[PDB]
Amino acid sequence: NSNICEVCNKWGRLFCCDTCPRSFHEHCHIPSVEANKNPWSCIFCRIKTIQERCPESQSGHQESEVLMRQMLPEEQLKCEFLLLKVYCDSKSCFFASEPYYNREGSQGPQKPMWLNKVKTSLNEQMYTRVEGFVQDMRLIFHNHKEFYREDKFTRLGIQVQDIFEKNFRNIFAIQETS
Protein backbone atom coordinates (compact mmCIF):
# COMPACT_ATOMS: atom_id res chain seq x y z
CA ASN A 1 0.00 0.00 0.00
CA SER A 2 0.93 3.65 -0.57
CA ASN A 3 2.41 5.47 2.50
CA ILE A 4 0.53 8.73 1.81
CA CYS A 5 -3.24 9.59 1.71
CA GLU A 6 -4.58 9.43 -1.81
CA VAL A 7 -6.64 12.61 -1.26
CA CYS A 8 -4.35 15.06 0.59
CA ASN A 9 -0.97 13.44 -0.15
CA LYS A 10 0.18 13.53 3.50
CA TRP A 11 1.20 10.73 5.84
CA GLY A 12 -0.48 10.06 9.10
CA ARG A 13 -3.01 7.54 10.47
CA LEU A 14 -3.82 5.76 7.18
CA PHE A 15 -6.36 3.00 6.41
CA CYS A 16 -5.30 0.76 3.57
CA CYS A 17 -7.51 -0.57 0.79
CA ASP A 18 -7.57 -4.40 0.63
CA THR A 19 -8.14 -4.54 -3.10
CA CYS A 20 -5.86 -1.80 -4.33
CA PRO A 21 -2.68 -0.04 -3.09
CA ARG A 22 -4.36 3.24 -2.07
CA SER A 23 -4.50 4.55 1.45
CA PHE A 24 -6.64 7.17 3.25
CA HIS A 25 -7.00 9.31 6.19
CA GLU A 26 -10.29 8.40 7.92
CA HIS A 27 -12.12 11.66 7.00
CA CYS A 28 -10.30 12.11 3.65
CA HIS A 29 -12.12 9.02 2.25
CA ILE A 30 -15.78 9.58 1.41
CA PRO A 31 -17.70 8.06 2.94
CA SER A 32 -15.41 8.18 6.15
CA VAL A 33 -13.49 4.91 6.43
CA GLU A 34 -15.83 2.28 7.86
CA ALA A 35 -15.21 1.05 11.52
CA ASN A 36 -14.89 -2.68 10.90
CA LYS A 37 -15.22 -4.48 7.49
CA ASN A 38 -12.31 -6.85 6.82
CA PRO A 39 -11.59 -6.85 3.98
CA TRP A 40 -12.23 -3.14 3.11
CA SER A 41 -12.48 -1.82 -0.39
CA CYS A 42 -12.02 1.96 -1.10
CA ILE A 43 -14.41 4.10 -3.19
CA PHE A 44 -12.16 3.74 -6.23
CA CYS A 45 -12.51 -0.02 -5.97
CA ARG A 46 -16.30 0.17 -5.45
CA ILE A 47 -16.71 2.40 -8.50
CA LYS A 48 -14.60 0.05 -10.64
CA THR A 49 -16.86 -2.87 -9.52
CA ILE A 50 -20.02 -1.01 -10.72
CA GLN A 51 -18.46 -0.46 -14.12
CA GLU A 52 -17.28 -4.10 -14.33
CA ARG A 53 -20.68 -5.50 -13.35
CA CYS A 54 -22.42 -3.37 -16.05
CA PRO A 55 -20.04 -2.67 -18.91
CA GLU A 56 -22.79 -0.86 -20.83
CA SER A 57 -22.86 1.76 -18.03
CA GLN A 58 -19.87 3.33 -19.85
CA SER A 59 -21.82 4.10 -23.01
CA GLY A 60 -22.53 7.82 -23.44
CA HIS A 61 -25.34 9.50 -21.57
CA GLN A 62 -27.16 12.82 -21.75
CA GLU A 63 -26.49 15.19 -18.80
CA SER A 64 -30.19 15.93 -18.55
CA GLU A 65 -31.00 12.29 -17.94
CA VAL A 66 -28.16 11.86 -15.44
CA LEU A 67 -29.31 14.85 -13.39
CA MET A 68 -32.85 13.47 -13.02
CA ARG A 69 -31.71 10.19 -11.56
CA GLN A 70 -32.84 9.42 -8.10
CA MET A 71 -30.12 9.05 -5.49
CA LEU A 72 -30.23 5.24 -5.19
CA PRO A 73 -27.11 3.60 -3.68
CA GLU A 74 -25.08 3.54 -6.92
CA GLU A 75 -25.73 7.24 -7.71
CA GLN A 76 -25.05 8.19 -4.04
CA LEU A 77 -21.69 6.42 -4.44
CA LYS A 78 -20.89 8.12 -7.75
CA CYS A 79 -21.57 11.58 -6.19
CA GLU A 80 -19.41 10.72 -3.19
CA PHE A 81 -16.58 9.72 -5.53
CA LEU A 82 -17.02 12.93 -7.62
CA LEU A 83 -16.85 14.99 -4.42
CA LEU A 84 -13.71 13.09 -3.42
CA LYS A 85 -12.10 13.78 -6.82
CA VAL A 86 -12.50 17.51 -6.10
CA TYR A 87 -10.91 17.24 -2.66
CA CYS A 88 -8.02 15.41 -4.35
CA ASP A 89 -6.95 18.74 -5.91
CA SER A 90 -5.01 20.90 -3.51
CA LYS A 91 -6.87 24.03 -4.71
CA SER A 92 -9.98 22.58 -3.06
CA CYS A 93 -8.77 24.16 0.17
CA PHE A 94 -10.22 27.45 -0.95
CA PHE A 95 -13.69 25.99 -1.25
CA ALA A 96 -13.75 23.52 1.66
CA SER A 97 -14.87 25.50 4.63
CA GLU A 98 -17.53 28.17 5.16
CA PRO A 99 -16.62 31.39 3.33
CA TYR A 100 -17.18 35.01 4.36
CA TYR A 101 -17.57 38.04 2.20
CA ASN A 102 -16.24 41.56 2.92
CA ARG A 103 -14.61 43.10 -0.11
CA GLU A 104 -15.02 46.68 -1.26
CA GLY A 105 -17.20 46.81 -4.35
CA SER A 106 -18.70 43.33 -3.97
CA GLN A 107 -21.66 41.88 -2.16
CA GLY A 108 -21.65 38.22 -0.90
CA PRO A 109 -23.80 35.59 -2.55
CA GLN A 110 -27.40 35.00 -1.63
CA LYS A 111 -26.78 31.29 -1.11
CA PRO A 112 -23.27 30.51 0.14
CA MET A 113 -21.98 27.02 -0.49
CA TRP A 114 -18.88 25.04 0.31
CA LEU A 115 -17.42 21.52 -0.01
CA ASN A 116 -17.81 20.47 3.61
CA LYS A 117 -21.49 21.53 3.48
CA VAL A 118 -21.98 19.29 0.38
CA LYS A 119 -20.12 16.51 2.19
CA THR A 120 -22.50 16.79 5.20
CA SER A 121 -25.49 16.89 2.90
CA LEU A 122 -24.45 13.69 1.15
CA ASN A 123 -23.77 12.02 4.49
CA GLU A 124 -27.20 13.03 5.80
CA GLN A 125 -28.93 11.78 2.52
CA MET A 126 -30.34 15.27 1.83
CA TYR A 127 -30.18 14.97 -1.95
CA THR A 128 -32.96 13.02 -3.63
CA ARG A 129 -31.63 13.39 -7.17
CA VAL A 130 -28.19 13.77 -8.75
CA GLU A 131 -29.31 17.26 -9.83
CA GLY A 132 -29.31 18.52 -6.14
CA PHE A 133 -25.72 17.53 -5.63
CA VAL A 134 -24.53 18.91 -8.98
CA GLN A 135 -26.39 22.22 -8.51
CA ASP A 136 -24.72 22.77 -5.10
CA MET A 137 -21.28 21.91 -6.53
CA ARG A 138 -21.67 24.29 -9.46
CA LEU A 139 -22.96 27.00 -7.10
CA ILE A 140 -19.68 26.95 -5.21
CA PHE A 141 -17.77 28.04 -8.31
CA HIS A 142 -20.44 30.40 -9.61
CA ASN A 143 -20.52 32.27 -6.25
CA HIS A 144 -16.76 32.63 -6.37
CA LYS A 145 -16.72 34.02 -9.91
CA GLU A 146 -19.39 36.53 -9.17
CA PHE A 147 -17.84 37.74 -5.89
CA TYR A 148 -14.21 38.12 -7.08
CA ARG A 149 -15.21 39.92 -10.31
CA GLU A 150 -12.00 40.97 -12.05
CA ASP A 151 -9.58 39.95 -9.36
CA LYS A 152 -7.27 37.31 -10.73
CA PHE A 153 -8.34 35.10 -7.74
CA THR A 154 -11.45 34.33 -9.82
CA ARG A 155 -9.25 31.86 -11.69
CA LEU A 156 -9.16 29.47 -8.76
CA GLY A 157 -12.95 28.93 -9.27
CA ILE A 158 -12.43 28.24 -12.95
CA GLN A 159 -9.68 25.80 -12.18
CA VAL A 160 -11.53 23.76 -9.58
CA GLN A 161 -14.76 23.84 -11.62
CA ASP A 162 -12.83 22.32 -14.51
CA ILE A 163 -11.72 19.43 -12.25
CA PHE A 164 -15.32 18.96 -11.14
CA GLU A 165 -16.70 19.00 -14.72
CA LYS A 166 -14.08 16.59 -16.19
CA ASN A 167 -14.72 14.14 -13.36
CA PHE A 168 -18.51 14.51 -13.71
CA ARG A 169 -18.27 13.64 -17.44
CA ASN A 170 -16.00 10.62 -16.64
CA ILE A 171 -17.86 9.15 -13.65
CA PHE A 172 -21.33 9.53 -15.15
CA ALA A 173 -20.12 8.57 -18.70
CA ILE A 174 -21.47 11.69 -20.31
CA GLN A 175 -21.55 11.42 -24.14
CA GLU A 176 -18.47 12.99 -25.62
CA THR A 177 -19.04 16.10 -27.82
CA SER A 178 -17.15 18.87 -29.65
Residue 17 found at the interface with Zn ion (CB under 5 A): yes
Decide: is 137 part of the binding site for Zn ion (CB under 5 A): no
How many CB atoms within 10 Å of residue 11? 12
Nearer to Zn ion, 53 or 152 (CB): 53
Q: Which 27-46 positions form the footprint of Zn ion (CB under 5 A)? A: 28, 42, 44-45
Measured from the CB atom, the residue of 8 and 163 that comes closer to Zn ion is 8
Is-contact 33 40, C-beta < 8 A? yes
Provide the H-helix boundaries in the chain: 43-53, 63-67, 73-87, 93-96, 115-123, 130-148, 154-171
Smallest distance, Zn ion to C-beta of residue 45, A:
3
| Stretch of 20-28, 65-73, 106-114, 157-165 contacting Zn ion, by CB under 5 A | 20-28
- Rounded distance, CA 167 to CA 85, Å? 7
Binding interface with Zn ion (CB under 5 A): 5, 7-8, 17, 20, 25, 28, 42, 44-45, 54
